[PDB]
Design a protein around this ligand. Structure first.
Ligand SMILES: Cc1cc2nc3c(=O)[nH]c(=O)nc-3n(C[C@H](O)[C@H](O)[C@H](O)COP(=O)(O)OP(=O)(O)OC[C@H]3O[C@@H](n4cnc5c(N)ncnc54)[C@H](O)[C@@H]3O)c2cc1C
Ligand SMILES: Cc1cc2nc3c(=O)[nH]c(=O)nc-3n(C[C@H](O)[C@H](O)[C@H](O)COP(=O)(O)OP(=O)(O)OC[C@H]3O[C@@H](n4cnc5c(N)ncnc54)[C@H](O)[C@@H]3O)c2cc1C
Ligand SMILES: NC(=O)c1ccc[n+]([C@@H]2O[C@H](COP(=O)([O-])OP(=O)(O)OC[C@H]3O[C@@H](n4cnc5c(N)ncnc54)[C@H](OP(=O)(O)O)[C@@H]3O)[C@@H](O)[C@H]2O)c1
Ligand SMILES: NC(=O)c1ccc[n+]([C@@H]2O[C@H](COP(=O)([O-])OP(=O)(O)OC[C@H]3O[C@@H](n4cnc5c(N)ncnc54)[C@H](OP(=O)(O)O)[C@@H]3O)[C@@H](O)[C@H]2O)c1
Lengths: 445, 445
């Protein structure tokens, strides 16, 4: 029987397993599926750990999430089309669940799917090579439970290893002598650490917004965020100042591009991540910027230089969970033969070029959201993934953007229409800034 | 011609290059040598970086050294037999030089040797395999300068990748909810961070002693160190208490095995390291405890299951630099044919078993130092490495041990006789406790 290797059991890899199990139930023959996961459990970025740097096994820590993290977008825009929030929880919950609650939801679906038996945990992939003579990938993996490395052959490899875990960590003059903490978002864990401190947050994207907000919520004396392109531009609280580019540090004094200076106690580098695959040779290794049209991926999933290799979730993300589903169903269908890939590499490269050109046609945020919605629509049309109201999910993101513009610190105190019923989610029992307790127990009451 | 791969350009790898260059100068034909180094420069652990976790390229940070680090033992006991301190700096320096000074000394020797041209920097090794049919090792390496992975064939591989860089990081109840910093020694950089703080130092070996001392020197409010075996036992300062095993944390309250408690602000795990090779398959991968008799290494260097593979510096270390030299000369001679390895695997295994039994015969510290001295003596007798006064080196370590027992905080305010001239080194211009400045400049005046 044909064999498929899935690298990673985060939301993407899990979606891939769910896709195959769903086809098997229909009566389709499916390949053998082996999912390799470095961590001790599934969940990907959502599987929280206090650990930073290297894990208990000596492997790079994957987790980039922190304490107090809540859903940063409306949940209504990431609902699985085949497994609703209502089905999982029974009842209606608010629109921005804490990490532990979304983790439960992710896990609930694959528990029902009975796909855990396909996963090997504590088993980082070390290497993948392809031999055209045999038409097989050789996957080398290390099993930390037995301290033994082995290799096995597969007809396909689906890489779902993430791209928000290997940090971009710039050096600025003074970083090495600064008497204070300098920590990348990747290693950030507990906002309580900076209570009563002046925090400098470098960056102007998703992580800067949220980590700055966590530090603010948990009692930072002040937040100073700095940008090198467009400011975030929100109406910040009184103790939050947005400055232009950092130039250098002299002692604990930060110098900015407009000539202004500020003393800071700690620096959090919210400077993003790189696509990094420590386990791939040149001929298989995806090289791309983080954006909505990923380089060298036909239909955003099939590797143009070897289309028997696929990648999931390698785009930057407005949509998340149901985009990964759409991708996983598509990749599944390509492997099963329900979809046939072009034999013309020129055609695959042109597909990517079209996507890049279309992404770049406008820099408008609503255009970007709609662009990715269009991508999900495109993939869903080409498989049996249950169609869902993508326009409705789109409107949720539009409303979410409006809410953040109005009150950046209170945007999580809002509800959105379910794409299934059209009904507004309930108000949560506690305002975000006062909801210091993380637990799922406290959230669900 | 024959080819040798050296993995790592720390003191061990550097000693290996120097060994081969020395033989070439004698008129011996030598193999091609390729040294792969993950970092941007040589020096191994001594090559300091402010970075922790993953480096700028996304690879695990090798550095385990910190600011304010000074030589841990007498320099007279680690002097190269073929390159004295005098020949280098010219003058006579004190006996405990700061990191930056020793780095310069290390650098000095290999600069003179003209071996840098054999080294590829920013080039972590990804994998090594051996094929018996071809009798070749295939080394796969990633060049971060070009973002390109390649592979090449070698007749020998010499692994000098260190074993004090992948940390042992235990979990204790309360670690994940502790409102304070928890950092393994590997990630410890600036003692100033803990000024005015109550610090818990877990451990009772080299790292606990020195990191605890740095925290003390740089103004920690108090140090509580904890042991699970033998206490360190020194006469500690007034604000330093040694406790038995940590049981758990409840909030910031540490509970110990004797029923006592102590509130702490930060925890530094000085809990040691594992031997960890992310780039080796089972049939080549050394598995061993950290000790003086390393498992599965004939003569402490030749891998018993494939003796064309060698390992340097995998022992725990009383002796350092001149032991690595002795090892490197020995491995060189095996490769050149000046030494012939046994064709009897049982004999190689018996060699290791003898070393283990002899190490275990006594737990006395002086016995342990003499044991490794005997190892260096053994290796040096079997090559043309110049013979030096090993007994004198022993006496230096013995004096060092006694100074530490007398005053653990001031042992660095001592001098020792040169192993070449028998002249007591001059006293430094500032007592250790007062010598806050790191610079080599401040040290040398
Ligand atoms: C800080 C942060 C907050 C976020 N918040 C939200 C949010 O609120 N809502 C939302 O919808 N999205 C959020 N995201 C987006 C996130 O990317 C997706 O939710 C989702 O986690 C991506 O799923 P994935 O499976 O593609 O990747 P990941 O979740 O990164 O999972 C990849 C998996 O691959 C494994 N892996 C990696 N290397 C190897 C190897 N060599 N061998 C084996 N396994 C390996 C990892 O251990 C991991 O389990 C957030 C992202 C970040 C960084
Ligand atoms: C905290 C600390 C303090 C110490 N203080 C002293 C002291 O005062 N005096 C003393 O004599 N000794 C000291 N030591 C001992 C130290 O082990 C030796 O001085 C020496 O650094 C060991 O040299 P090495 O080359 O064997 O290993 P390392 O110094 O660890 O160097 C190994 C090299 O291999 C490289 N490498 C690792 N993996 C890869 C890969 N996959 N591909 C390519 N390259 C790789 C690393 O980047 C590194 O350059 C200390 C050790 C520690 C941990
Ligand atoms: N954290 C979340 O809430 C969350 C949730 C889900 C998904 N994600 C995804 O994660 C992706 C990454 O989010 P992110 O905020 O972590 O990273 P990011 O989007 O790449 O943003 C990095 C920020 O740091 C700045 N920066 C980068 N390098 C810098 C340097 N050397 N000096 C100064 N500033 C620098 C960037 O500015 P320039 O624009 O000038 O480069 C940008 O403002 C997002 O696109 C988002 O999809 C995030
Ligand atoms: N020059 C220096 O200052 C320096 C500094 C660091 C390292 N080194 C070199 O590298 C070696 C390592 O030194 P090291 O101190 O870093 O490591 P180490 O010698 O392995 O010591 C580890 C210490 O932590 C304790 N420990 C380990 N696991 C623990 C756990 N789960 N819970 C509680 N305690 C735990 C150990 O106790 P047990 O004994 O009970 O296991 C031991 O006391 C040394 O032999 C030396 O060669 C040198």
């Amino acid at each position: 029987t044909k064999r498929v290797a899935v690298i990673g059991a985060g939301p993407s890899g899990l979606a891939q397993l769910r896709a195959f199990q769903s086809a098997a139930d229909q009566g389709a023959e499916i390949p053998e599926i082996v999912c390799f996961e470095k961590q001790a459990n599934w969940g990907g970025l959502w599987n929280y750990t206090w650990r930073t740097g290297l894990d208990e096994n000596g492997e790079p820590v994957h987790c980039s999430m922190y304490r107090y993290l809540w859903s940063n977008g409306p949940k209504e825009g990431l609902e699985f089309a085949d497994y609703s929030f209502e089905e999982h929880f029974g009842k209606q919950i608010a629109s921005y669940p804490p990490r532990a609650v979304l983790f439960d939801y992710i896990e609930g679906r694959v528990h029902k799917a009975d796909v855990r038996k396909w996963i090997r945990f504590n088993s980082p992939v070390r290497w993948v090579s392809y031999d055209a003579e045999t038409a097989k990938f050789t996957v080398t993996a290390h099993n930390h439970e037995t301290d033994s490395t082995y290799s096995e052959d597969f007809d396909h490899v689906i890489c779902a290893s993430g791209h928000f875990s290997t940090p971009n960590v710039p050096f600025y003059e003074g970083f090495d002598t600064f008497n204070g903490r300098i920590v990348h978002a990747h290693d950030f864990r507990d906002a309580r650490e900076f209570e009563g401190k002046d925090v400098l947050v470098m960056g102007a994207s998703s992580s800067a917004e949220d980590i700055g907000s966590q530090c603010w919520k948990y009692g930072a004396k002040s937040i100073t965020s700095c940008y090198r392109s467009a400011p975030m531009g929100y109406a910040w609280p009184d103790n939050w100042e947005e400055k232009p580019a950092l130039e250098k540090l002299t002692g604990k004094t930060a110098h900015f591009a407009d000539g202004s200076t500020r003393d800071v106690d700690a620096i959090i580098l919210c400077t993003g991540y790189k696509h990094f695959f420590s386990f791939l040779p040149d001929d298989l290794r995806l090289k791309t910027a983080n954006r909505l049209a990923t380089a060298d991926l036909y239909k955003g999933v099939a590797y143009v230089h070897n289309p028997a290799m696929f990648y999931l979730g390698m785009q930057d993300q407005w949509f998340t969970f149901n985009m990964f589903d759409a991708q996983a169903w598509w990749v599944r269908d390509a492997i099963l033969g329900r979809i046939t890939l072009p034999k013309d590499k020129a055609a695959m490269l042109a597909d990517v070029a079209e996507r890049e050109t279309r992404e770049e046609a406008s820099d408008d945020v609503k255009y970007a959201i709609r662009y990715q919605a269009d991508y999900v629509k495109e993939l869903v049309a080409e498989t049996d993934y249950p169609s869902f109201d993508i326009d409705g999910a789109c409107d949720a993101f539009f409303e979410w953007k409006k809410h953040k513009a109005k009150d950046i610190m209170a945007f999580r105190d809002n509800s959105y229409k379910s794409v299934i019923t059209g009904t507004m989610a309930p108000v949560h029992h506690t305002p975000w800034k006062e909801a210091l307790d993380d637990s799922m127990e406290a959230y669900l009451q």
